Amino acid sequence: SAKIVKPNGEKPDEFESGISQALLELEMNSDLKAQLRELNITAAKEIEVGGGRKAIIIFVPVPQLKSFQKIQVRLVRELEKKFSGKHVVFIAQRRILPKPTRKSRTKNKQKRPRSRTLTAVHDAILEDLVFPSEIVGKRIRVKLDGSRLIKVHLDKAQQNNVEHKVETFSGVYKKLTGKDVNFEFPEFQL
Amino acid sequence: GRMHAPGKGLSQSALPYRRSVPTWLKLTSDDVKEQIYKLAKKGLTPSQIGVILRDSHGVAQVRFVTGNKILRILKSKGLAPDLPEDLYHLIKKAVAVRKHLERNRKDKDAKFRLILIESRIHRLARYYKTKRVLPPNWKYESSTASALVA
Amino acid sequence: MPLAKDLLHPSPEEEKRKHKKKRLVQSPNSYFMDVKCPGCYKITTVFSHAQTVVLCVGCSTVLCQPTGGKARLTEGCSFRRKQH
Amino acid sequence: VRMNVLADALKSINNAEKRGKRQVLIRPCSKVIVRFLTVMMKHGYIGEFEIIDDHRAGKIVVNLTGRLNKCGVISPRFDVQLKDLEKWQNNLLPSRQFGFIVLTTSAGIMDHEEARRKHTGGKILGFFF
Amino acid sequence: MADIQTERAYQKQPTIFQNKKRVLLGETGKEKLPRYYKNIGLGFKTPKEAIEGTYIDKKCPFTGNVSIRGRILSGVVTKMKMQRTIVIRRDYLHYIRKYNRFEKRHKNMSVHLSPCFRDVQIGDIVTVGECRPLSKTVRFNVLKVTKAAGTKKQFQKF
RNA sequence: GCUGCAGUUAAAAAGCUCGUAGUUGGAUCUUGGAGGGUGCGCCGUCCCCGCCUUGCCUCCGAAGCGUUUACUUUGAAAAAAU
């Protein structure tokens, strides 16, 4: 119920409950169970796409992700179908640590890991938002109006799973960072 | 460009972007770490392990299929040897040049070259020492160097 | 240099002619392949330029010799690239 | 080798505009290059720029109009004392009226006008007009 | 430890008296030496060694008769050749306008070092405090040993 | 000749390289409406400020208290004559 899988320091509910139930629904089965069972989730958040189909974002412990990666496509396919009208995906909760000041104080708290920096984390978010494709490259555009836009290049193959999504990834990303993201396709070295 | 000559030559790896992959790469961390350790048993250097792994068996970079550089893998198993390999091959090279110069006292080129090599060694050791790898007070000496490299 | 290129989107053809280090954003110019030799049926992955002898799984065979550059594959052999 | 990276970016720009060029690719970029490119941008001296992400140190493409006579870098990064800023802008700016000295202060990389208004000071990066 | 007392004169803290006495256990009494100490002030913790110790050192800021007043300085330990005293090197920046770059410059400062501090080893950064003339050269006394195994160039342990 | 010099031929790059001191050193770790000064005749113009992750902890003050600095900023302390 709420207790097990919606935990991570808060019980709660509603959607988390629905999705969890959906996972159980999937759980009845074969190899489409036992493999999942281990997987667990911290929380779910829902945020929309501009005309109005919402996207559902799921949070993972991070040690878990390799396994989630293991399934992903098949699971997402199920969650989109059972829960339709939403774009489902998977993001790992990452900690982020503040850069020390100085007088922040500083009781030289244990170093911290780049694998804890806000930029690194955000990069991870970008990496997580798209899936099996791969981010081929990136560029940053400085708009006349002091604005910045990040062009995130994408692979080509197998993309289709993401193609329809793109707009949500942009919106979702915004909700998290407040930065603007855009997507593109390549090229194929020759 | 270059340190002990006027050579310009740009030349390199050119390492790949793609964050992940290879994808056509199955195997596993398990697999190649075993592979690495077994090769290092045989006496192979990390450069050498990386090459042979690269060409014979699928490993584009050992880093990517395992979050660790080959040397770090070796050291963690307990395969790290006494001085870093670059320093080794330098010391060994200055040895072979030194042996050749003892044979042929008439070769001024060789004497020049020996100096160059030796300077490169002393600076490298200064760097390793600054960085704990070598005990502060480490030095390379002709006398003892011969005995050191083998 | 006539005050005309889109340094940001350069052409794939003239990007493909340039040095690996001179490429817009860098990238290599080398690849991997699967290699055959009828007697066996399984397939060894090989690196385009190779230095090492590469021998097959079992048969002391051959499977290219090295050179200045790309390994020269040996006589009666076949090879799909290839991935991403 | 390299001591600074800014000086290269700035020079590269200046030679682009001198040729009659409308774009450049600078390498390798840095937070400081971005910040400087940005101050330039706010003021009009360049168009829009783009940081391309090699898995290395970066490469920037700047699209430039042609309002730029010169963007220089001051090395070393001398300390300036609020009434050495008045002395700097006079040394290296065309008329009292325009052109900016851009420095780095505790409270941000800024053009000296913004410096005067905040009322902070620091070490001098460079300039343009 | 090493027998302190070593010299020819009986080392003692002034006006801190004894009197051992008869009856059983101890025997006399167990500590056998009353010890007097004080905190320097300025929030410098008086290290345990001072309180725990047998050593005499009049010159000690914690155990001895010296007051710390005046400049509080920090420097890097260049020498620990002399007994109970060290030499520290103080780097400072000299500003030259006439055209403007100033050039690193340094001064060495002799400073007394209480036996309470140990591992005073060259390389260690140390915080010394001004004091009454201890010796013709020495104006200062080591108040705090800043330390660090860090500076990694080796790996310190505990 | 710092600002602000010249050194192919005018006065001036050591025959060449190694090299300690000294100097000099790549990218990369925080983000995404009104208060106060002086001009112009109740109106406004133009700075400056907290805003539309930002010292932790001890448990408002106090205290703990600073990771070190340089830097720069705001104060005091700053002989009169000049």
Domain shared by B74 and B101, yes or no: no
Q: Which residues of E touch B136 (CB under 8 A)?
A: 153-154
Instruction: Provide the token pair at D77.
Output: 């990064």
B118: nearest nucleotide, CA–C1' criterion: F18
CB-based contacts of E46: which residues, under 8 Å, 6+ apart? E37, E38, E39, E40, E62
Give yes or no for a contact between E88 and E107, defined as CB atoms under 8 angstroms apart: no
- What span, in angstroms and rounded, lies between the C-alpha atoms of A101 and A82? 48
* D72 strand F contact, CB < 7 Å: no
Interface check for D55 against chain B (CB to CB < 8 A): the answer is: yes
Bridge partner residues of E76 (DSSP): E89, E125
Query: Angle at the Cα of B19 (from C70 to C66), degrees rounded to 5?
Result: 15
Nearest CA in chain B to A157: B23
Which residue from A139, A142, A146 is facing D52, i.e. has the nearest CB? A139
Considering Cα of B118, then B120, then B123, then B124, what sign does the dihedral take? negative
Domain shared by B88 and B132, yes or no: yes
φ, ψ for residue D112, nearest 5 deg: -70, -20
Which of residues 6 to 45 on D have a Cβ less than 7 angstroms from any strand F atom? Answer: 28-32
Domain that holds residue C42: 1-84
Kindly compute the dihedral angle of the four CA atoms of residues D48, D51, D52, D55, in this order, to the nearest 10 degrees: 180
- What span, in angstroms and rounded, lies between the C-alpha atoms of B74 and B85? 12
φ, ψ for residue E34, nearest 5 deg: -70, 140
Interface check for B131 against chain E (CB to CB < 8 A): the answer is: yes
Kindly compute the dihedral angle of the four CA atoms of residues C36, C38, C40, C43, in this order, to the nearest 10 degrees: 10
Secondary structure of residue C44 in the 3-state scheme: strand
Taking Cα atoms as reference points, which of C64, C27, C26 lies closest to residue C48? Answer: C64
- Quickly tell me which residue has 């200046």 as its tokens: D14
Nearest CA in chain C to A139: C8
φ, ψ for residue D87, nearest 5 deg: -65, -45
Residues in chain A: 190
Domains: count for chain A: 1
- What span, in angstroms and rounded, lies between the C-alpha atoms of B13 and E97? 48
Look at strands E68-79 and E85-93 and give their pairing. Answer: antiparallel
CB-based contacts of D17: which residues, under 8 Å, 6+ apart? D64, D66, D68
Give yes or no for a contact between D49 and A142, defined as CB atoms under 8 angstroms apart: yes
* E43 strand F contact, CB < 7 Å: yes
Nucleotides of F under 7 A from a protein CB: 2-4, 17-20, 22-32, 47-49, 53-56, 64-74
**CATH number of residue B86's parent domain:** 1.10.287.10
φ, ψ for residue C81, nearest 5 deg: -55, -80
Cα A17 from chain centroid (whole Å): 19
Give yes or no for a contact between C25 and D53, defined as CB atoms under 8 angstroms apart: yes
Domain boundary among B80, B101, B122: B80
Q: Would you say domain E2-152 falls under CATH 2.40.50.1000?
A: yes
Question: Does D52 sit within 8 Å of A138, measured CB to CB?
Answer: yes
- What span, in angstroms and rounded, lies between the C-alpha atoms of E57 and E110? 17
Taking residue A114's Cβ as centre, other Cβ atoms within 10 Å add up to 9
Give yes or no for a contact between A167 and D62, defined as CB atoms under 8 angstroms apart: no
Peptide bond into D28 cis (omega under 30): yes
CA E88 to C1' F39, whole Å: 61
Question: Does A134 sit within 8 Å of B20, measured CB to CB?
Answer: yes
Bridge partner residues of E145 (DSSP): E126
Question: Does A143 sit within 8 Å of D49, measured CB to CB?
Answer: no
Domain boundary among B80, B102, B124: B80
Domain that holds residue B88: 81-149
Could you write out the three-class secondary structure of A120-168?
A: HHHHHHHHHHCCCCCEEEEEEEECCCCCEEEEEEECECECHHHHCCHHH
Domain that holds residue A78: 4-189
Nearest CA in chain A to C83: A157
Taking residue D37's Cβ as centre, other Cβ atoms within 10 Å add up to 24
Q: Give the method of determination.
A: X-ray
Q: Helix D31-43 crosses helix D6-19 at what angle (to 10 degrees)?
A: 40
Taking residue E7's Cβ as centre, other Cβ atoms within 10 Å add up to 8
- What span, in angstroms and rounded, lies between the C-alpha atoms of A86 and A48? 8
Instruction: Tell me the CATH class for D69-129.
Output: alpha beta
Domain shared by B139 and B98, yes or no: yes
The string of DSSP codes covering A19-32 is: HHHHHHHHHSSSSS
Look at strands D59-63 and D122-128 and give their pairing. Answer: unpaired
φ, ψ for residue C33, nearest 5 deg: -145, 155
Any long-range contacts for C36-44 (C-beta under 8 Å, 24+ apart)? C36/C77, C36/C78, C36/C79, C37/C61, C37/C63, C37/C76, C37/C77, C38/C76, C44/B56
Burial of B146 (0-12, 13-18, 19+ CB in 10 A): middle
**CATH number of residue C74's parent domain:** 2.20.25.100
- What span, in angstroms and rounded, lies between the C-alpha atoms of D104 and A161? 47
Instruction: Provide the token pair at B70.
Output: 């080959």
Nearest CA in chain E to B134: E154
Which of residues 115 to 154 on E have a Cβ less than 7 angstroms from any strand F atom? Answer: none
B interface test, pick of C31, C32, C42 with most B CB neighbours within 10 Å: C32
Radius of gyration of chain B measured on its C-alpha atoms: 19
CA B86 to C1' F79, whole Å: 68
The CATH architecture assigned to D1-68 reads 2-Layer Sandwich (3.30)
Domain segments of chain D: what residues?
A: 1-68, 69-129
Secondary structure of residue D61 in the 3-state scheme: strand
Burial of B99 (0-12, 13-18, 19+ CB in 10 A): exposed
In Å, what resolution does this model reach? 7.8
Which of residues 6 to 65 on A have a Cβ less than 7 angstroms from any strand F atom? Answer: none
Instruction: Provide the token pair at D125.
Output: 């990066």
Which residue from C23, C27, C47 is facing B55, i.e. has the nearest CB? C47
CA D97 to C1' F41, whole Å: 29
- What span, in angstroms and rounded, lies between the C-alpha atoms of B76 and D108? 44
Give yes or no for a contact between A108 and D14, defined as CB atoms under 8 angstroms apart: no
φ, ψ for residue B47, nearest 5 deg: -50, -55
Q: Which residues of C32-65 are buried (b: 16+ CB within 10 A; e: fewer)?
A: bbbbbbeeeeebbbbbbebebebebeeeebebbe
Instruction: Provide the token pair at D1.
Output: 């080798």
Look at strands A148-154 and A180-184 and give their pairing. Answer: parallel
- What span, in angstroms and rounded, lies between the C-alpha atoms of D96 and D87? 11
Give yes or no for a contact between C46 and C60, defined as CB atoms under 8 angstroms apart: no
Q: Is residue B8 part of a domain?
A: no
Amino acid letter, C14:
E
Domain shared by B88 and B136, yes or no: yes
Look at strands E140-145 and E104-112 and give their pairing. Answer: parallel
Domains: count for chain B: 2
Bridge partner residues of A151 (DSSP): A139, A182
- What span, in angstroms and rounded, lies between the C-alpha atoms of A17 and A4? 10
Distances (CA, A) of B3 to B6, B7, B112, C21: 8, 8, 15, 21
